[PDB]
Design a protein around this motif. Structure first.
Motif, PDB file in Angstrom:
ATOM      1  N   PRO A 127       0.831  -1.287   0.150  1.00 47.84           N
ATOM      2  CA  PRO A 127      -0.105  -0.010  -0.214  1.00 47.84           C
ATOM      3  C   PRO A 127       0.879   1.199  -0.142  1.00 47.84           C
ATOM      4  CG  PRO A 127      -1.021  -1.536   1.502  1.00 47.84           C
ATOM      5  CD  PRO A 127       0.380  -2.202   1.151  1.00 47.84           C
ATOM      6  N   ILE A 128       1.838   1.182   0.500  1.00 45.13           N
ATOM      7  CA  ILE A 128       2.953   2.441   0.681  1.00 45.13           C
ATOM      8  C   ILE A 128       3.811   2.614  -0.611  1.00 45.13           C
ATOM      9  CG2 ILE A 128       4.445   1.186   1.778  1.00 45.13           C
ATOM     10  CD1 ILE A 128       4.547   4.086   3.366  1.00 45.13           C
ATOM     11  N   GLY A 129       4.042   1.433  -0.995  1.00 46.13           N
ATOM     12  CA  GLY A 129       5.106   1.500  -2.335  1.00 46.13           C
ATOM     13  C   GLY A 129       6.390   0.886  -1.959  1.00 46.13           C
ATOM     14  N   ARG A 130       6.685  -0.189  -2.746  1.00 50.25           N
ATOM     15  CA  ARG A 130       8.008  -0.844  -2.170  1.00 50.25           C
ATOM     16  C   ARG A 130       9.241   0.159  -2.549  1.00 50.25           C
ATOM     17  NH1 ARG A 130       9.114  -5.286  -0.537  1.00 50.25           N
ATOM     18  NH2 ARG A 130       8.122  -7.485  -0.897  1.00 50.25           N
ATOM     19  N   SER A 131       9.157   1.222  -3.215  1.00 52.43           N
ATOM     20  CA  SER A 131      10.269   2.060  -3.482  1.00 52.43           C
ATOM     21  C   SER A 131      10.345   2.926  -2.227  1.00 52.43           C
ATOM     22  CB  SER A 131       9.912   3.152  -4.406  1.00 52.43           C
ATOM     23  OG  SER A 131       9.911   2.618  -5.712  1.00 52.43           O
ATOM     24  N   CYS A 132       9.689   2.652  -1.063  1.00 49.68           N
ATOM     25  CA  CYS A 132       9.778   3.474  -0.082  1.00 49.68           C
ATOM     26  C   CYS A 132      11.288   3.556   0.636  1.00 49.68           C
ATOM     27  CB  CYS A 132       8.717   2.996   1.054  1.00 49.68           C
ATOM     28  SG  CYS A 132       8.974   1.247   1.748  1.00 49.68           S
ATOM     29  N   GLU A 142       4.645   0.542  11.474  1.00 50.01           N
ATOM     30  CA  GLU A 142       4.002   0.571  12.825  1.00 50.01           C
ATOM     31  C   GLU A 142       2.350   0.883  12.661  1.00 50.01           C
ATOM     32  OE1 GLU A 142       2.819   2.025  16.441  1.00 50.01           O
ATOM     33  OE2 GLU A 142       3.851   3.543  15.217  1.00 50.01           O
ATOM     34  N   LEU A 143       1.905   1.926  11.666  1.00 51.77           N
ATOM     35  CA  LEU A 143       0.576   2.202  11.537  1.00 51.77           C
ATOM     36  C   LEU A 143      -0.257   1.086  11.225  1.00 51.77           C
ATOM     37  CD1 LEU A 143      -1.119   5.175  11.042  1.00 51.77           C
ATOM     38  CD2 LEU A 143      -1.067   3.933   8.724  1.00 51.77           C
ATOM     39  N   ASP A 144       0.565   0.152  10.439  1.00 56.85           N
ATOM     40  CA  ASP A 144      -0.322  -0.917   9.955  1.00 56.85           C
ATOM     41  C   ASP A 144      -0.951  -1.979  10.994  1.00 56.85           C
ATOM     42  OD1 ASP A 144      -1.184  -3.008   7.790  1.00 56.85           O
ATOM     43  OD2 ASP A 144      -0.073  -4.248   8.690  1.00 56.85           O
ATOM     44  N   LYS A 145       0.001  -2.246  12.194  1.00 58.11           N
ATOM     45  CA  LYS A 145      -0.526  -2.793  13.407  1.00 58.11           C
ATOM     46  C   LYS A 145      -1.798  -2.061  13.964  1.00 58.11           C
ATOM     47  CE  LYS A 145       3.534  -2.747  13.895  1.00 58.11           C
ATOM     48  NZ  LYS A 145       5.193  -2.454  14.513  1.00 58.11           N
ATOM     49  N   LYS A 146      -1.671  -0.584  14.080  1.00 58.55           N
ATOM     50  CA  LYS A 146      -2.643   0.205  14.697  1.00 58.55           C
ATOM     51  C   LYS A 146      -4.096   0.117  14.214  1.00 58.55           C
ATOM     52  N   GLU A 147      -3.851   0.429  12.785  1.00 56.59           N
ATOM     53  CA  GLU A 147      -5.444   0.390  11.969  1.00 56.59           C
ATOM     54  C   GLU A 147      -5.576  -0.587  11.099  1.00 56.59           C
ATOM     55  OE1 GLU A 147      -7.509   4.344  12.686  1.00 56.59           O
ATOM     56  OE2 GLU A 147      -7.687   3.481  10.696  1.00 56.59           O
ATOM     57  N   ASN A 148      -4.644  -1.732  10.964  1.00 60.97           N
ATOM     58  CA  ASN A 148      -5.147  -3.195  10.548  1.00 60.97           C
ATOM     59  C   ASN A 148      -5.270  -2.744   8.743  1.00 60.97           C
ATOM     60  OD1 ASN A 148      -4.960  -4.219  12.910  1.00 60.97           O
ATOM     61  ND2 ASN A 148      -6.986  -4.317  13.270  1.00 60.97           N
ATOM     62  N   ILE A 149      -4.299  -2.062   8.121  1.00 60.26           N
ATOM     63  CA  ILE A 149      -4.571  -1.836   6.649  1.00 60.26           C
ATOM     64  C   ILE A 149      -4.423  -3.335   5.851  1.00 60.26           C
ATOM     65  CG2 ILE A 149      -3.511  -0.376   4.851  1.00 60.26           C
ATOM     66  CD1 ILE A 149      -4.713   1.240   6.886  1.00 60.26           C
ATOM     67  N   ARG A 150      -3.259  -3.778   5.997  1.00 60.95           N
ATOM     68  CA  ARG A 150      -3.081  -5.003   5.149  1.00 60.95           C
ATOM     69  C   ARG A 150      -3.949  -6.013   5.486  1.00 60.95           C
ATOM     70  NH1 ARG A 150       3.271  -6.591   6.088  1.00 60.95           N
ATOM     71  NH2 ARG A 150       2.637  -5.694   8.056  1.00 60.95           N
ATOM     72  N   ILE A 174       5.543  -4.124   4.619  1.00 63.45           N
ATOM     73  CA  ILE A 174       5.046  -3.361   3.976  1.00 63.45           C
ATOM     74  C   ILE A 174       3.953  -3.779   3.126  1.00 63.45           C
ATOM     75  CG2 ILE A 174       6.449  -1.274   4.112  1.00 63.45           C
ATOM     76  CD1 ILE A 174       7.724  -2.718   1.308  1.00 63.45           C
ATOM     77  N   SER A 175       3.916  -5.188   2.813  1.00 60.77           N
ATOM     78  CA  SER A 175       3.348  -5.911   1.400  1.00 60.77           C
ATOM     79  C   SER A 175       2.795  -7.051   2.036  1.00 60.77           C
ATOM     80  CB  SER A 175       4.474  -6.204   0.820  1.00 60.77           C
ATOM     81  OG  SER A 175       5.394  -7.397   1.235  1.00 60.77           O
ATOM     82  N   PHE A 176       2.000  -7.671   1.168  1.00 63.41           N
ATOM     83  CA  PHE A 176       1.511  -9.018   1.293  1.00 63.41           C
ATOM     84  C   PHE A 176       1.640  -9.627  -0.225  1.00 63.41           C
ATOM     85  CE2 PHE A 176      -2.346  -7.956  -1.045  1.00 63.41           C
ATOM     86  CZ  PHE A 176      -2.600  -6.778  -0.297  1.00 63.41           C
ATOM     87  N   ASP A 177       1.598 -10.892  -0.257  1.00 65.76           N
ATOM     88  CA  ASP A 177       1.756 -11.512  -1.544  1.00 65.76           C
ATOM     89  C   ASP A 177       0.325 -12.294  -2.142  1.00 65.76           C
ATOM     90  OD1 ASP A 177       4.886 -11.749  -2.074  1.00 65.76           O
ATOM     91  OD2 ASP A 177       4.557 -12.977  -0.049  1.00 65.76           O
ATOM     92  N   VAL A 178       0.283 -12.405  -3.386  1.00 63.54           N
ATOM     93  CA  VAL A 178      -1.029 -13.016  -4.037  1.00 63.54           C
ATOM     94  C   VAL A 178      -0.432 -13.879  -5.117  1.00 63.54           C
ATOM     95  CG1 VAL A 178      -3.077 -12.570  -5.341  1.00 63.54           C
ATOM     96  CG2 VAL A 178      -2.025 -10.842  -3.703  1.00 63.54           C
ATOM     97  N   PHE A 179      -0.728 -15.175  -4.908  1.00 67.20           N
ATOM     98  CA  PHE A 179      -0.400 -16.171  -5.507  1.00 67.20           C
ATOM     99  C   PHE A 179      -1.323 -17.262  -5.769  1.00 67.20           C
ATOM    100  CE2 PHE A 179       0.784 -19.120  -2.054  1.00 67.20           C
ATOM    101  CZ  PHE A 179       0.749 -18.319  -1.070  1.00 67.20           C
TER     102      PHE A 179
END
Ligand SMILES: [Cl-]
Ligand SMILES: [Mg+2]
Ligand SMILES: [Mg+2]
Ligand SMILES: [Mg+2]
Ligand SMILES: [Mg+2]
Ligand code: NA
Lengths: 242, 242
Positions: A127-132, A142-150, A174-179
């Motif tokens: 969601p943030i970009g792998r280029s981060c 850290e924000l992903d824990k708090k608001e459960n984005i992924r 930062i990510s998740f996989d889709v396979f």
């Protein structure tokens, strides 16, 4: 009859996230005199080369980077298929269009680039970009824990593409996989079924449910062993083959 | 009034896609006993280290990687700038989201990955993604020329975000660039206009329109010279300064 030893690499052959010790390297090679050996990991061939040496295709009977979608047998490259040929272009697009339409809706502190990385056997989605940058990564982590984005993201995709035969895994910051269903580590079992092995031993450090070795450990084709650390793996190989 | 020479790096002081020669390098260091030198190119600093050597920041009075976004002067860093810092997280988020939503609406034969490439002074946007193969770029470009896909995308982007200091230039086969107004080679002039040089010589190899040196060449603050190769840059320097 003839047998084959399959080893996961990270945490199984090596200490986590580190090269292998030569003590183990020599042990594996002493073991190769008794039966054939193979390795499998989710990382690309370059990462496996780093963790186990450049000559890795020359020192292992099988080498299965990217869970086996890149596959070497006896020094030579096998038979390969990618994610586009398997799923078909329309489902790929329908899934890409959804992920972009979804990421455009997320509210974040910072967003950057490479939101879908097209790999050989998966779509990495960040969601943030792998280029981060490294800082922006930990901050998004850290924000992903708090608001459960992924987590919420993976839930919408499981529902929207239920039955299209995909698996969704979350890893790292930062990510998740889709396979495709079954393109985890038991994918490489495609290349050892027809080669006439009586017993195929597997070793992995994350055989717990939800781990990267679980499905290949519970597979009937493998006599699976659950290993705690590299020394344990040598402990177990010492007991079976000597 | 004192004078300053600015060169484009690729094509002007080096052979295209090549490292500077030892003769060119040495020539320049003797020019530096008569005048002040400065180099500008669109490549990031590390590549610029590959072209001119690792000590590049002592060798020239000014080193302007990434068209001057990075700026070293007299051996030290004078300034750093990115487009995240310049437009600010908010509106560059609005610009990313708009692009993500728009790409999801595009009916394409093949979509791939890396639709939004984040660079320090420009966003690179590609409806099909930059990970695709050459064979698929051609497939998209033959589609694009017919159905004007980048032309329409750029249009709506131009109606959406151009009172915000953004320019859009289509380029190449698949993508287009999004950058703040005047973030071409012309950018680095803000660093040297305040040091009191009467004439500012510019030497580039691509000074005609559609060139990376066109706008700095046309700039009133620069006494520009179009150059065909390093042998020519040397020849011109001789006729100018000795
Ligand atoms: Cl992307
Ligand atoms: Mg492991
Ligand atoms: Mg089993
Ligand atoms: Mg040039
Ligand atoms: Mg001029
Ligand atoms: Na790699």
């Amino acid at each position: 009859g003839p047998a084959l030893c399959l080893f996961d690499v990270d945490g199984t052959l090596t200490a986590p996230r580190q090269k292998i010790t030569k003590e183990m390297d020599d042990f594996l090679q002493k073991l190769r005199q008794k039966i054939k050996i193979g390795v499998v990991g989710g990382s690309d061939f370059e990462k496996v080369q780093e963790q186990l040496g450049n000559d890795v295709v020359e020192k292992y009977d099988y080498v299965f980077p990217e869970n086996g979608l890149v596959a070497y047998k006896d020094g030579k490259l096998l038979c390969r298929q990618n994610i586009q040929s398997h799923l078909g272009e329309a489902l790929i697009q329908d899934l890409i269009n959804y992920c972009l339409s979804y990421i455009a809706k997320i509210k974040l502190p910072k967003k950057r680039g490479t939101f879908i990385e097209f790999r050989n056997g998966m779509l990495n989605v960040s969601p943030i970009g792998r280029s981060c940058s490294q800082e922006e990564r930990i901050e998004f982590y850290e924000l992903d824990k708090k608001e459960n984005i992924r987590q919420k993201f993976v839930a919408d995709l499981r529902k929207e593409f239920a039955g299209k035969g995909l698996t969704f895994s979350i890893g790292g910051q930062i990510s998740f996989d889709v396979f495709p269903d079954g393109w985890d580590k038991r994918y490489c079992l495609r290349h050892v079924e027809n080669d006439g092995y009586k017993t195929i031993y597997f070793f992995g450090d994350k055989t717990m449910p939800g781990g990267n070795d679980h499905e290949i450990f519970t597979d009937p084709r493998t006599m699976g062993y659950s290993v705690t650390a590299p020394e344990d793996t040598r402990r177990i190989c010492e007991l079976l083959f000597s």
